[PDB]
Amino acid sequence: AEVNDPRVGFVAVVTFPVDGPATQHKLVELATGGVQEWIREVPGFLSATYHASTDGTAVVNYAQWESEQAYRVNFGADPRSAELREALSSLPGLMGPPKAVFMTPRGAILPS
Amino acid sequence: AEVNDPRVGFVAVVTFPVDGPATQHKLVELATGGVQEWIREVPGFLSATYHASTDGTAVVNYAQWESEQAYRVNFGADPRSAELREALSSLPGLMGPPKAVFMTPRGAILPS
C-alpha cells in the first residue's frame, strides 16, 4: 500500500541479523520464494517489504497491516506464522533471533 | 510511493528515542510542521512516513528515496537539512541521538 494510505493502521519493522550480503540475498530469496504464499490473501495483510541493509549485516522487513487486531488474529494466532518463523530461522548465516518494533503511522510527507 | 514502486532505490529508517507519547507527538509535529515543505521539492525525495512505537518510546521515519545520492547530497548537502537536524536534536524529551539504518528494497509480498 502507499506508505501514507489511511488503511495502514499497524506496522511491524523486523530486523534479521545476518553474517553478510550472501546471506542477505538468500534470506530475501527464502522470504519471497513461496513459503509465505498463504499470507497474501489473509484479511488485513497489506504488504511485507524486505530490504538488504547497505552494510550487509541485516535484512529488514517493513510490514503493513490494516490494524493490530488483524495482525493478531490473522497472523500471530495462525500456527502457520510459527511454521514461517521456523523456516526463516533455518537459514545458515542468520546470527540471532529477529528483532521486532511495533508502531503506528502518525504523519507523512509526500512530494509536491 | 507504493512500497514496491520501482523508483525506490534507497530507504533510510531513522529511529528517535523519546521519553513517552507526549514527546512522540511533539516530534512528529515538528517534523511534519510547514517550514519543512522544502523537502517535498528535493529531487529524488519520494516520501517520509513518521510512526509512533506503540510503547511510547520511539518515533520511526521510514523514508523512500530514488538513490543514496538523493538522500546524502540532494537532501543532506542542503543547509536546511542541518537546520532540521539541529531542531530535532534540541527538542526536550529526546533520550539520545537518532539512529539510522540504510537499506535497499529487495523483495515484497503483496496481496493480489
Could you explain how this protein is built, in words?
The structure is a homodimer of 112-residue chains. Chain A has 112 residues and is of the alpha+beta class. Helix content of chain A is 27%, strand content 32%. In chain A, a hairpin with a 4-residue loop joins strand 2 and strand 3. The two termini of chain A are 19 Å apart. Chains A and B meet through strand 1, helix 1, strand 2, strand 3 and strand 4 of A and strand 1, helix 1, strand 2, strand 3 and strand 4 of B. Strand 2 of chain A pairs antiparallel with strand 4 of chain B. It is classed as oxidoreductase. Keywords: monooxygenase, actinorhodin, streptomyces coelicolor, oxidoreductase.
* Helix share, percent of chain A: 25-40%
Number of domains of chain A: 1
- The oligomerization state is homodimer
Number of helix segments of chain A?
A: 3
Structural class of chain A: alpha+beta
Q: Could you describe the largest sheet of chain A, including whether it forms a barrel?
A: 4 strands, antiparallel
| Biggest chain-to-chain interface with counts | A-B, 46 and 47 residues
- Reading side by side through the largest sheet of chain A, how are the strands ordered? 2-3-1-4
Shape descriptor of chain A:
globular
What's the N-to-C terminus distance of chain A?
19 Å
Q: What is the CATH topology classification name of chain A? A: Alpha-Beta Plaits
| N-to-C order of helices and strands of chain A | EHEEHHE
Level-1 CATH class name of chain A: Alpha Beta
Total number of strands of chain A: 4
Report the β-strand fraction of chain A as a percent range: 25-35%
Radius of gyration of chain A: 14 Å
CATH architecture of chain A: 2-Layer Sandwich
Pfam families (chains A, B): ABM
Organism (chains A, B): Streptomyces coelicolor
InterPro entries (chains A, B): ABM_dom, Dimeric_a/b-barrel
Domain ABM (chains A, B): 10-102
